[PDB]
Design a binder for these strands. Sequence first.
RNA 1: GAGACUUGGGCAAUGUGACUGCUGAUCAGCAGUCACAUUGCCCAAGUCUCUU
RNA 2: GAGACUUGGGCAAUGUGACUGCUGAUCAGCAGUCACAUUGCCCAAGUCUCUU
Lengths: 16, 1541
Amino acid sequence: IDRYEQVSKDFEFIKI
Amino acid sequence: EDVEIKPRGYQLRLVDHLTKSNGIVYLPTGSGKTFVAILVLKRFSQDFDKPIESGGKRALFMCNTVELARQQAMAVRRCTNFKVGFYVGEQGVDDWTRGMWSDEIKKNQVLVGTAQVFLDMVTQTYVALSSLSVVIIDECHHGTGHHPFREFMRLFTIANQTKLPRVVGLTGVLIKGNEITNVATKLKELEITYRGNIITVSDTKEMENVMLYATKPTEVMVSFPHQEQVLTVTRLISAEIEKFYVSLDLMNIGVQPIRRSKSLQCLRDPSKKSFVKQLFNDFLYQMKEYGIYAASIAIISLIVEFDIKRRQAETLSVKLMHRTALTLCEKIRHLLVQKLQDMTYDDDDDNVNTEEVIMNFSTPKVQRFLMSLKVSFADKDPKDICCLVFVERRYTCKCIYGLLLNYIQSTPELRNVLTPQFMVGRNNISPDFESVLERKWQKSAIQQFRDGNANLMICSSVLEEGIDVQACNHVFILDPVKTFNMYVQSKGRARTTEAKFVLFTADKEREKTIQQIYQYRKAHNDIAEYLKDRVLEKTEPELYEIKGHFQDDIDPFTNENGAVLLPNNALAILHRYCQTIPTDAFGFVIPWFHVLQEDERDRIFGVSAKGKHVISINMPVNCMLRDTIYSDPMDNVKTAKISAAFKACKVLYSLGELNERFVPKTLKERVASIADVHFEHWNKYGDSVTATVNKADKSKDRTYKTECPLEFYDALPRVGEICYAYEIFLEPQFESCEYTEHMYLNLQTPRNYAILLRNKLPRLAEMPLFSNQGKLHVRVANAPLEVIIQNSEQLELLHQFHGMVFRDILKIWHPFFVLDRRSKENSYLVVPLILGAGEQKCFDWELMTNFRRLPQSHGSNVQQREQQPAPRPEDFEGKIVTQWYANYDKPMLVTKVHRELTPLSYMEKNQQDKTYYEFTMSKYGNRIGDVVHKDKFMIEVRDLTEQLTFYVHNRGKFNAKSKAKMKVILIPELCFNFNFPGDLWLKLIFLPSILNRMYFLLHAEALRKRFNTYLNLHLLPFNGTDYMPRPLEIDYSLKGKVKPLLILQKTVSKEHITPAEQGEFLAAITASSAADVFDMERLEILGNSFLKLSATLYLASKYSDWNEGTLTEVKSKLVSNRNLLFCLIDADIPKTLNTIQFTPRYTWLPPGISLPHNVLALWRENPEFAKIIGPHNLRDLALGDEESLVKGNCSDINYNRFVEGCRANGQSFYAGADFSSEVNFCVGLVTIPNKVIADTLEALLGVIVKNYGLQHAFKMLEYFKICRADIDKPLTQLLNLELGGKKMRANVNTTEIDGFLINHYYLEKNLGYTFKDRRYLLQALTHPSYPTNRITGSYQELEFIGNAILDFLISAYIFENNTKMNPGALTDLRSALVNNTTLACICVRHRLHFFILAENAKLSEIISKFVNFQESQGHRVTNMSTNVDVPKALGDVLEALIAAVYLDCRDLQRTWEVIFNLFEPELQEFTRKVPINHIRQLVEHKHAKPVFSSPIVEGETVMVSCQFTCMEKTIKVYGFGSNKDQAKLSAAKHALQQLSK
RNA sequence: GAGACUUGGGCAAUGUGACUGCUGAUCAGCAGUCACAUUGCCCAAGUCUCUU
RNA sequence: GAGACUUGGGCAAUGUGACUGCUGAUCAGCAGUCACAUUGCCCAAGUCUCUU
Ligand SMILES: Nc1ncnc2c1ncn2[C@@H]1O[C@H](COP(=O)(O)OP(=O)(O)O)[C@@H](O)[C@H]1O
Ligand SMILES: [Mg+2]
Ligand SMILES: [Mg+2]
Ligand SMILES: [Mg+2]
């Protein structure tokens, strides 16, 4: 693997 | 604190229910349960101040951790009126006694401390359990299993089951663990533990207003991908890491103790090998989990911690492995940064580049963490941010912190707002990254967070429980939640309103995470269901519950006084007791545990214990019992182990080894190992090792008697013996001038006075005698003239002549004296000798047959003078005359005869144009009618001196006596004439000064013979010897290669032993008070220096298994003046010392004359009249001439007089008056102080060492029973006295030396002494702080002996090379030359600071700044700018290194050569002005007196201010420094510079 | 050659002050090495009852 | 897999004890020596008595 896989900036602080 | 302490809506009924019975409260954190505990204390505050023995009580506050102990201590101090005891281990509690505990209980009405401290307090029964009114239990959810809470609670059953203390349980979370299913099965465990019901607030809804202080935060969660993708470099480094793991498994470190698994399964690697494996495992775990950029800081952490471990390593084997590990971690860092730099080619915006590389190389989870933080804060105000972040591991915390600083710095939006921090549990990791361990930050991170300095807090599980923190506004749980209690308390750390709880979870593990969280929610909702559904009933009668709960384990043991041993506590006490044994080189101080094999169980206990494990306990090789003890059959290995430990404890106590406290016993004394063999002779004098005197000058001045010399006892001649006559020669030294005509001519005359002896006399050297005209040299005849008393009447006439000589010609007499012929103490005769047949001189019987009664001067009338025949001119030449008309009876010496002069004489300077006849008629014509014989004869006369003690050197000056003196002429018939010749009179004046040197010269000869006989010197120069005359002690104030030392040159050779001159011994005899031209004080210093060196070397050789502290504290008493006094008293020397000033007129008893014998008897044999008779009574014994010159005793009237003298003293104000001061010389007593006697002891030592060398001196020191001989071999030379061991020598072979000696030849290039054994050098350069001290030692033992070596060498050199310097400057010069600062300058000049091995914070730079100061100042010896601290180590390094040089060859000449090569400039610079201490110099000023203020602790430095009246101005100056003794010198340094005006 | 006498100078024996070279005890602060004890946790393996 | 239980590696937290190291302050002991206030001894300069 040359480099990590970037993650999406947006998400949600979903209630648990 | 405040009056707003009114209770909440629940605590009143809470404490009301607590009063009825034991209770446990379950309320969430931040609800003031500590306050309701204080309220309980208030309710139970009835009987506190009363003592326990009178029925009083107290309380006990149980704790969990020392930090929480301090927190609760502050909480109870702020709002209570009682006294609280803060009890924590590792201080006090393990050293306190029952008295201290009881006294603290008397004052302290309540106590706080950790669990085990109270366990030891109660089980050992310092105080009875019933003495506590209530017991307060914090974190009661821990009260299960083998935790100390349960162990303490166990004591209640075995104790008195009446009037028990109350127990209260407090916990934010009731259950610890994951067995949350059927929580009713868990609650009742803690319920029966304290046998009290659980209670919770019923009105939760109404008190949720107060619960708003602990508001439930919102619960959100962040889901991140967990894709299994890893980079290439990780696989590159993993193979090398496992290669290093193998290589470490192949390391060759020294032996290590037994280490294996918990259940005693297969062996485990030693700690020093497995610690690095554990560290690398955790590093790899972090690298895999959090990302490459995380490892980029983790690797720096590994570097900085491996450097610490390398610095702290003792054995050299560990250092190589740690250096290899450090190089490996350096490679890892290099490759990580290589990856970083291979990336980041996209952009040149360094801030944006750093932020983007952090975003990229971060794992998706940490990326989500970063941007969740970014969106949560978004550049809000710093005060709005206050939160806790919880991760799992400590190195995780450190690495997360290290990456967060860089992330924050890479973002301007968070740069000014975020201030992260981290702290962890007990495994205290260094809170720094880029520096070695040198930090001292007293304020812990919790205090920093409480101050508001930090806003974001990273922490491990350390902060989950107990510690009280501000109600933080956020909670981010980076690592997965795994336990119920931790989740409950972490959600309780967002105590404030509007708080946010953020949990980071994996995408592929999100479903199980939400399932687990839901299960935790159900459990937390169901915890209160047991109490809500509980049937309303008490918790009391079920004692069987408690009995079954605690009887499951192993039963305890108890004995008298209530001391109870906890079986679960047996391992700790066994390990502590077995750790007190004297270990071998690698002896093991722990019991060895070995589980028996399968079929050995029946071998010991039978087939009944097939499944029940049995283990043996093996005692150490030095235990009280060398056997082994086996465990009872138990169902598991751990219970078997604890049972074996308990049985071992029981047997050890039943054998009496362990005391009632069960603590291991101690040691009493060590110094008394030698205090019995060295100081045993004090007891017969009333003294002991532990006895000292400090009052009334007791044991400081002691009354002693004197004995006549061995050659004067029984010396009185008798009839029919060969008597020996020694004539006296008086050689004039002064030139023959007009003033010195008579004292020269009449002193060179053949006529002399001699001494008749029945004994022999040695050859006595010439001594000087100072009279008014000058100095006289006196020598005694070597060969006596043999004469025989051929008639009793001849002896009687000689003795009468002696008596009348002393009675009249010198007037040295007293009324109560009696002519002595019976007593033999200093009894002899003096007799003139004249030419009778040839050159040999016989008795001048003409004198003795005439001068039985001296011619009594009387007045002559004109009728008598008319009948008186005309005197011839020869009748007065050389005769003695005196004037009878005058009232003066003083004798007058005839100087010049007048054959050519008439009474009508010529002119004179005063009576110009006057004759002597006219002058005498005018002056004394009242008592002369007329001169009937008025023709052809007058006399020219000169008077003679009256002084007798002709000892003072300068009395004979003539500079101002050179002036004109009158010429005196008398008329003969008016002056009475004596037939005695003034020729003999002039010599007979000097007699008492001759006798009081003959006395002590004979004493000195006796001592010289004794000290030449004991040391078996009977060689050629000691029987046919000729004694050099008396020397003058001028310093008595009465007006490149090396030169080898003369003090030691007479140790390896015998030709250089100079014969011990009798003058040296006589100097050693005479004290200062006698005031002669010679004294003992100069030899004093050398003698004391040799005594110090010998004592230190002897002790350091006999006791090579002792520390220098004990050596010093024993050689103190060995060399103390109290020891020397008693030693020399045992030597019975004091009978031969010269102290008194020789007052002849009053105290010097005549030899052949003494007071009456009956007086001696009844005044010396009677204790009741010992010192009651005073001199006033004695002087009244004016006995008759026949009663004092023939009869020899007192008459009846005189008898009554001197027997009532004491009674009259007892009936007058003379009662109680001292009659011993110079009025007890009749019995020969003398009062001498201790300082004199001790000084003569080492003065004899100095004489012996000077004339006979070091070896003979040390051999003689054996004679004084100070240096006790060894039984195996009596004693050896001062050199070759084999000393050394495990503290004077390095305990490593030659291979390990170079690893501690990086450079040796460079030290050699200056020192000049090629060491043949570098172990001494290494031990000399090893500082105590250096890690090897625990196994090899420190340079302390070497500095102790090098101190004495340098001291004595310098003292001897300054003694021998400077012959006319008093000790006032000798000690000053040596102290200046042995001062620590100049030693430091010597060290830095020769550059020994390079090789010195030490590891300490301040020592690291003190040496560098001092050497920089010296180099800037050009190596200027201070004997100074900005009060720079002197590195006192360097001087101690030289002190130890000189000894190291000495021991390598055991020769002192080589050491002196090296020392001279070292000190050559210093011994040429100091001799000029001998610089003194600057404080001393300031106090030396006449009126500019100093006064120094108190020490000031205003900061890390200290200072003192001084005042001096310079130019009569009340000036004030101040100085700063590290210590008071440093500023004081610098304060004086500024002040003395101020005197430069 | 002595005495009386004054001023000053110098030396030795008691009470205070202070320096040098060894040290010890106590208190406080900081720091290191090592052993052992308790709670809870996941991971891997194994035994038995037990569901399949 | 559940339950009972064991073993091994690992994690977090808590605590006891031993050992020595560094620093600052306080107290006291040992040896050498010096400066300021008390008696005795010897001198410098000068006065008087006594002795020609
Ligand atoms: N009745 C009260 N009177 C005074 N102060 C209170 C009262 N109740 C709570 N407090 C304060 O609220 C804070 C609660 O924190 P803490 O005592 O740690 O809670 P808990 O004791 O429940 O763990 C304490 O600092 C306490 O001073
Ligand atoms: Mg709290
Ligand atoms: Mg002395
Ligand atoms: Mg020293």
